[PDB]
Subunit: 64 residues, 12 copies
């Protein structure tokens, strides 16, 4: 059985690095992370000093 | 990193109050709740005594 | 077996009351109405004297 | 010919009042506003003192 | 309030049995599981000895 | 001209048998049923004694 | 209250004439037909002597 | 950089002529119109003397 | 078994004729073409001397 | 690099067997078939003697 | 009230730089740009000397 | 007439380089490749030694 958690990673550099930021977080607390699906991408502009790229992913991990 | 949980709130009064019911629940157990996105709305009729409005939201919270 | 009919209710007050307007109509002529799913919402402005909220629902009812 | 502008209204009270907030703004600067279609709804929580309901609409107006 | 978890069940027999595999898992660790919605189906071919049917479901459970 | 009716069939056995349950019902009361399109599938768990598979179909029939 | 019926019109000439074929049928049996929304278009090739254009519409009519 | 404006053209003749009606309007006031994408089509019936075909397009134009 | 190929036809006259242009091409090289589904429509303006209507179709054909 | 082909399998028994019918066909002529994604399901009723279940899949295979 | 404009940025380097190209343009002529949502990405190949990455964004800005 | 093939490119570096990997492959065997549309992006984690970015594109090419 796989389960997915819906995480948004951020990066001041690129959409790929923002996807890695969410995946790194999932791998800090979950075992058996096996793939991630990008579901949304965007850029935060008016709440930050530098534009921040955001990449939202479903991160799938195999249970037990 | 943000994470989202997918909750359906209910209200006998309105779709806005059913969204607040899910958000209130998220805020009882999570810290740093920052926004919610409505993904579905509906009305339960044939299992209740009063119509019950349901509003399903992804509730986003900032991790650590 | 459930069947659904696709109805748009209207209200000069709110999207929740426009959903109830469609459901009230379904319950006037159908038996065993059991739930409704909101599929669209909008506001009529330039054909009315007061803005009219419209909420389109699939209204499900159990057959026999 | 109709044209649409994509506006997000806000309200501390309800999703219906947030739709009216966008429509009121369109009617301040455009003539012949004729209908609005709701395309998204959400709630801002972690950047405000009171939850703020947001309702995003395409607001259609007839040209000339 | 309902919450949903996004699980993918697997079966070497059918898409219905792969949906039951995810639901069985949810029922091992959650109380008050009340319904599941199928969101995706697929077949793993080139990483297994027998084709494996996969059925991804949102499994809803009532909170407290 | 074809018309479609939106029916949800149920089965305690499989998603295919739940699609046949809706189609059987359409064929009891309509003539010239010609095809059905699956639009949604789900499983009722917390209102029944046995899980019930549900398959929602648009059932098309040729008019006159 | 508006209700919609889901009809597919056909024409050997064009997608516009196939939409009119469904609307003509709705107007033969319903009163107060007020608008139609195109939801799908296609062409039947291998079951006919001439290609047949098909245009599927939700045809809305005002109730009473 | 391209920008798009969302326009609905109308015609009493066909969906193609209603798309041209929106594009003609865009070309009256914008320079460098380069392509249009159809996003919706429908037919106004109960507010007109003749059916009016409507074709909604995103009309893209190159900026400067 | 059916297979589909994804083709975009073009016409300087109409969206129906652009769908026929893709279907004519499929029928020049494939046997047993049985139906086509329209998936997208658009108009090329800024790369041509006359507007060119484009209609993208999945063209289905029965295998062997 | 993976490529996908869009095939519809058929079965008089079930949606799972109709998915296997498309996959079996892909495996007769392609090497390195690695997974399939279900994209649509339906039932042919009015052109056959027995209902025929149809399951449309994108069948992915690794190139070289 | 927020308004969004739909812009496509281009870059010969990456999808992230093409998103920044649209955002830079919006910030040259609008005040209070606050976030952008990616809605589409693609690559122009056969009209250019170098591949050009294109990233289409809704760029939101707060009104007054 | 344009035709599209559905390819998934991979890269250990970025989503842009994974899109180029699919396009490079299409250009090795097809003539007149003219544009590609991104339809999906994801990251393979649990079957590789380094994360692999995957970008799925419809690659369009002009026929003859
Ligand atoms: C992708 C993205 C989306 C956002 N959407 C909203 C929104 O709807 N409302 C708001 O107040 N702020 C928003 N902020 C947003 C920030 C980002 C990066
Ligand atoms: C929105 C809504 C959706 C529902 N959908 C179903 C369904 O598919 N099947 C069922 O037995 N009950 C259902 N009950 C539903 C109740 C509500 C409120
Ligand atoms: C939601 C909504 C949508 C509408 N869409 C259209 C349309 O496409 N064309 C038209 O003439 N009038 C329209 N009127 C509309 C009125 C409402 C309330
Ligand atoms: C609906 C809604 C959506 C939002 N989405 C985002 C987002 O993606 N990222 C962010 O930093 N803030 C966001 N803020 C958001 C605020 C609201 C109200
Ligand atoms: C449904 C399904 C989808 C898959 N999608 C991918 C994919 O995008 N990339 C990959 O390396 N493997 C994949 N493997 C997949 C396996 C299954 C069963
Ligand atoms: C598919 C499925 C969906 C349902 N959705 C809901 C829902 O939204 N709310 C509710 O009270 N019960 C629901 N019951 C549902 C039952 C089934 C089988
Ligand atoms: C639009 C269109 C769609 C069709 N889809 C199918 C299908 O899935 N299966 C089948 O046997 N025949 C089909 N016939 C079709 C005919 C037309 C015109
Ligand atoms: C496409 C089309 C859509 C429309 N939708 C609506 C609607 O939702 N409500 C209404 O009062 N009138 C409507 N009028 C409509 C007119 C057209 C042509
Ligand atoms: C429908 C249509 C879509 C197009 N989309 C694009 C695009 O994204 N970028 C571009 O450079 N040219 C484009 N050209 C387009 C031409 C047509 C006809
Ligand atoms: C799924 C399915 C879809 C179909 N759709 C159509 C259609 O649009 N028009 C038609 O003449 N026959 C059709 N036949 C169809 C047959 C099947 C099985
Ligand atoms: C994303 C993208 C999409 C395009 N779509 C089309 C199209 O439909 N037709 C055309 O003539 N050119 C097109 N050109 C396109 C160029 C790009 C970059
Ligand atoms: C995007 C992506 C999607 C995938 N989806 C699946 C899946 O559904 N099932 C599976 O066994 N492996 C999968 N593997 C996947 C690998 C990637 C990269
Ligand atoms: Cl989710
Ligand atoms: Cl419907
Ligand atoms: Cl838009
Ligand atoms: Cl495809
Ligand atoms: Mg930096
Ligand atoms: Mg988002
Ligand atoms: Mg009360
Ligand atoms: Mg729901
Ligand atoms: Mg009042
Ligand atoms: Mg509507
Ligand atoms: Mg207040
Ligand atoms: Mg939004
Ligand atoms: Mg076995
Ligand atoms: Mg999946
Ligand atoms: Mg049994
Ligand atoms: Mg459903
Ligand atoms: Mg003729
Ligand atoms: Mg169809
Ligand atoms: Mg005339
Ligand atoms: Mg519309
Ligand atoms: Mg000519
Ligand atoms: Mg297209
Ligand atoms: Mg048999
Ligand atoms: Mg289909
Ligand atoms: Mg360079
Ligand atoms: Mg695009
Ligand atoms: Mg490296
Ligand atoms: Mg994919
Ligand atoms: Na989730
Ligand atoms: Na219907
Ligand atoms: Na717009
Ligand atoms: Na394809």
């Amino acid at each position: 059985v796989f389960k997915k958690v819906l995480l948004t990673g951020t990066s001041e550099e690129s959409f790929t690095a923002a996807a890695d930021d969410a995946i790194d977080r999932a791998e800090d607390t979950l075992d058996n992370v096996v793939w991630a699906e990008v579901v949304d991408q965007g850029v935060e502009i008016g709440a930050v000093e530098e534009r921040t790229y955001q990449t939202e992913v479903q991160v799938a991990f195999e249970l037990d």
